[PDB]
Amino acid sequence: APQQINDIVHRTITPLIEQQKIPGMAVAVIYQGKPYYFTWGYADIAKKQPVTQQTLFELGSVSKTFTGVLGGDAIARGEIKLSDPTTKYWPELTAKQWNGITLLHLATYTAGGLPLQVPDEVKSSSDLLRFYQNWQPAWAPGTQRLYANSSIGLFGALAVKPSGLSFEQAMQTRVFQPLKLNHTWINVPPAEEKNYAWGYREGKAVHVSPGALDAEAYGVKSTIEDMARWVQSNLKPLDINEKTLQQGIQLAQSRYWQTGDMYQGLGWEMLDWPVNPDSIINGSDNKIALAARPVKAITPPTPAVRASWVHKTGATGGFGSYVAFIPEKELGIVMLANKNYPNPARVDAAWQILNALQ
Numbered sequence: 001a002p003q004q005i006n007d008i009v010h011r012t013i014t015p016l017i018e019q020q021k022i023p024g025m026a027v028a029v030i031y032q033g034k035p036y037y038f039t040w041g042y043a044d045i046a047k048k049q050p051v052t053q054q055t056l057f058e059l060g061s062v063s064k065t066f067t068g069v070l071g072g073d074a075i076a077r078g079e080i081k082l083s084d085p086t087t088k089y090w091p092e093l094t095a096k097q098w099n100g101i102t103l104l105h106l107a108t109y110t111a112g113g114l115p116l117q118v119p120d121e122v123k124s125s126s127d128l129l130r131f132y133q134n135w136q137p138a139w140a141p142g143t144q145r146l147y148a149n150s151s152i153g154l155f156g157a158l159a160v161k162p163s164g165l166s167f168e169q170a171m172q173t174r175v176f177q178p179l180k181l182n183h184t185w186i187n188v189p190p191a192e193e194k195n196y197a198w199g200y201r202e203g204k205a206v207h208v209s210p211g212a213l214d215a216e217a218y219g220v221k222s223t224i225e226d227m228a229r230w231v232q233s234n235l236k237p238l239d240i241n242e243k244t245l246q247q248g249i250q251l252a253q254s255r256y257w258q259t260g261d262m263y264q265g266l267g268w269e270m271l272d273w274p275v276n277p278d279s280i281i282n283g284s285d286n287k288i289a290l291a292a293r294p295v296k297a298i299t300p301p302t303p304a305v306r307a308s309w310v311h312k313t314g315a316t317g318g319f320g321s322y323v324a325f326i327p328e329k330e331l332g333i334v335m336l337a338n339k340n341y342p343n344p345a346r347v348d349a350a351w352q353i354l355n356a357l358q
């Protein structure tokens, strides 16, 4: 624990926790490839359980990076191609608006206005088919980006069909296990419940609610140790022994579309490094509830660029997560909290830490 890392992490995160009233937090810094861990506060306020390196947090949409990589692995395996029509894998999707909508569009939120959330009313598989058949695009495919669980979530579900594996079994056997992420889960097992933090929303303890395509869009839970290993794997995919997973990671960091200064990968988002910090900090704000942006196709996609700020925010009702890394510097950070606090605060803290260390 080099004093420089200790000092910049504590000087940044302690005030963040105070300002945002975060009940519990874990941080990992990856520096020259090695991880350093920090924890604060409570995984469970009522039961006085501290955050530890073994505490499970809901990753929310950071899960999309696992979905993106699993899809990349399926491409590498020759099971699917991003140029394939969605209907190749879901023949029941016969409605005409689907003509021209490819797995690429699903994976990258560019299908033409699929909504952020699958409606809560969608409970059955038949409800899900009806939803997609009836959905009317606002835009031609490949023209506008609208961040959407219904888009990348469907990509994940379809990406695993040729394997015949469930999404969970595919993720376990093809991503979690080979990377030794042995405390990373789509469904938290009873054996691990003692480590599963509560999220806190308006002071109430909460966990994520079941929903359609939840696993695929926002459903992973993990520890700070496994998430540091996830960052290491994404920093250095060539050290991965499993060839299709190595390739999948590289495919997920390829640049498929540009909007403003940001590039869309599979799950991951990227900017050129050095970044303008106001560009990523301000850009991370949700503004917004719905933010439709024209995109420029990158034809063909640029393979993973080492001089990039690669990142993803995630939230559930009770949790806020952030991951960022810069491959050319062998540098990264994971921030896991059990409160959904504003994105710009996450990115500001991450930038302050990584910039001081690079």
Ligand SMILES: *[B]([O])([O])[C][N]S(=O)(=O)C1=[C][C]=C(C2=NN=N[N]2)C(Cl)=[C]1
Pocket: 059, 060, 061, 062, 116, 117, 149, 207, 208, 209, 210, 218, 313, 314, 315, 316, 317, 318
């Ligand atoms: B990702 O960007 O984190 C997805 N964000 S989301 O707004 O679509 C979202 C998804 C799930 C949940 C949730 N379900 N049960 N608890 N929380 C929320 Cl609040 C938001």
